[PDB]
Symmetry: C2
Subunit: 410 residues, 2 copies
Amino acid sequence: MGKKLSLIDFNEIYNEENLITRANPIENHEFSDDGIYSERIFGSYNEDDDDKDIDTIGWINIEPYYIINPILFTIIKKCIPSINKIINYQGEDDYIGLVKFKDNFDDLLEKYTDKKKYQKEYDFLIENHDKIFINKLPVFSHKLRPATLLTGSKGKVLAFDEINNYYNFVIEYINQINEGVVSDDSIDLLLLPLLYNMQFYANNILTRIISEYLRGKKGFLRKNIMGSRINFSARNVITPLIGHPIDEVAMPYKTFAELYKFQLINLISKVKGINYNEALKFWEKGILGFNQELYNYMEELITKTKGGCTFLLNRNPTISIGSILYLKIGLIKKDYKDLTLGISNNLLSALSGDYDGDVLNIIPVFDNKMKEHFSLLSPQNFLVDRNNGRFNGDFDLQKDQILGIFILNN
Amino acid sequence: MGKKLSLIDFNEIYNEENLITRANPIENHEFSDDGIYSERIFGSYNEDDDDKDIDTIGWINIEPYYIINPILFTIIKKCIPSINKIINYQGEDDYIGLVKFKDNFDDLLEKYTDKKKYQKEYDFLIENHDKIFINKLPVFSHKLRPATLLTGSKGKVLAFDEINNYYNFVIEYINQINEGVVSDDSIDLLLLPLLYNMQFYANNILTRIISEYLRGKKGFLRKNIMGSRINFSARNVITPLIGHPIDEVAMPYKTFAELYKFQLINLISKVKGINYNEALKFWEKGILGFNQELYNYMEELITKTKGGCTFLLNRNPTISIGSILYLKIGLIKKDYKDLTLGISNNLLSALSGDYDGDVLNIIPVFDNKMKEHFSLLSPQNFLVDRNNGRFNGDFDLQKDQILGIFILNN
């Protein structure tokens, strides 16, 4: 909640064009162009025609009246504990009201504060005095806050989150206040409570957005920091491979098909002169069982692609150099049942994994530029131990390999 | 907030006759008979036809769905921390739903308990199983929640308590769920959001009742304990009176007129055979300045009244026996400017007051029964010291009087 960050002066950024001064949720059986769910300023389902993003932000005007800034409310509350009582209208001045509070705020801040307890807050109030009172409160895009239509016994009804209720309530309260000319002549003293409710609703709007961050905005973003879910990824068991170079590997039929699907569909469309959807039908048929034709397209990709077909192999935990390795797909297996990645025994020591049923993550790299940059993680570059500069025994001959050379030479 | 008192089963008290199912306060330009602001069920103070006191309470039916008891929510929350999460849909049973929570409450309560901390709360929940779930919500009389009449340009202004805005909102949510009989086709239950917000709204309504108790409801009762504001009361400065008995005192013209205003008008109406409104006009003229005629009626009243014309004189602090004394109105002063009570010097010592310009409180007693009962506080009854049974020196001769008797005898 409480964060130290730059504040924004709403009045400068406020745009009169996207101003919601109409509180009506619907107008004459239609979504109001001036309503909260406005296609003109916020956008609609046809968002490509609109060219208006989620960033589109609506505005509401409280002029000629000012409210306490919702973000700055808590610090004022700590400085002035009686803020909740004082704002309501029912020392020298007590419980004067919101409009009266504005006129005497500077004196009141000195009047009811403990300097030692809240000096930093008081200094902040002096620093950002101009931003204490707000004339316009922003409303975020209706695309973020959906209103799903439902059928009702009396009539079709729109279900929507409470945030929309908070916004429309605020606009409803303000709309009547500005209209009255001869009503207001002496009513102005009981008009103040109406403004008070608006301030509380805006505070809940601020609190709800804080909860919105918890509900898959900040939680999802920090979950992404916890674990970014990458497409074009795979998990596979490792099996020993013999007779092929160390960097090259053998990949199962199913593994290659999914990761290089779009590359595979490109070739089938070009070779057979078919639509992309029709090419997908060929790929779907191949997924079910081994067919030589799709294997031929897969074999051509590994054979003829520039830089080869390469990927990154990581064994978690990724705590050591060589945990993630840049490798090449030498062969594609012709057994549908075989679902094990074939790796050289020399790679195993660097990865620190075992052929005990452990699974390694496969992340293919496509761009030739990206392929080159990740080639610094290749096994060939890791033949040199980085601390010593000597050859790394991790990539040296292992148990079975050493014995054969020993019998040969010794 | 830490209060223990008997709970109420709303179904037992539920009355279909006093049922508020209409959220619209006004119907066809008149107060709705079924509305929240209903003259039909609550009444109108002006017309005698209402015959209904504030004790009248309206009723609402929430069936076929139940809400958590508003008073017991905090007690349930301490036992079950997930109550807030569970009721809404977004541990193992996190966010199951209100209806699912209602069915599985016994399982959830056993699941979420503190063995040492919340054993007392758990036992209370066992005691009040029947009162946990609420099917009927009470609505208090519209007479208590005033609507101040004001003119508005858009429309005539309807004034409402902060709670009153919530009341019309609460009724709307349930109204829609019941209208549909077969409409939902079991495909999508959106009733939970409507019920969910309602629980908080009723809870805030309950908190408002706590604030309403703070707003001069129970506090005014405490104001009576702190100081009951007694009408038919007076305050006057004390000046010595000589030549009259200890029990008798001299009362100013204005003091007697106001205190005995209703007694005096009865005599004036009878003697002149005039209406009480016309008799009041004469009383107003006499109060403005001294007139012999009103003094004569007052003089007759003090002479001929049954039990005499008597009052209670208290000097605060009323911490001693004799601080409040039952006294008699012997004479009425004929000087309008003279506003000093004439008391015997012997009374002063018991009262503990002095003739220094301090004021003593006058509480007149009217009923003959009360006069006898309060006569136990008379000076003659207190001539006997209750501690010893001896004569009370407070009522004896004082400094100036002792000197004369001493010169006489010694």
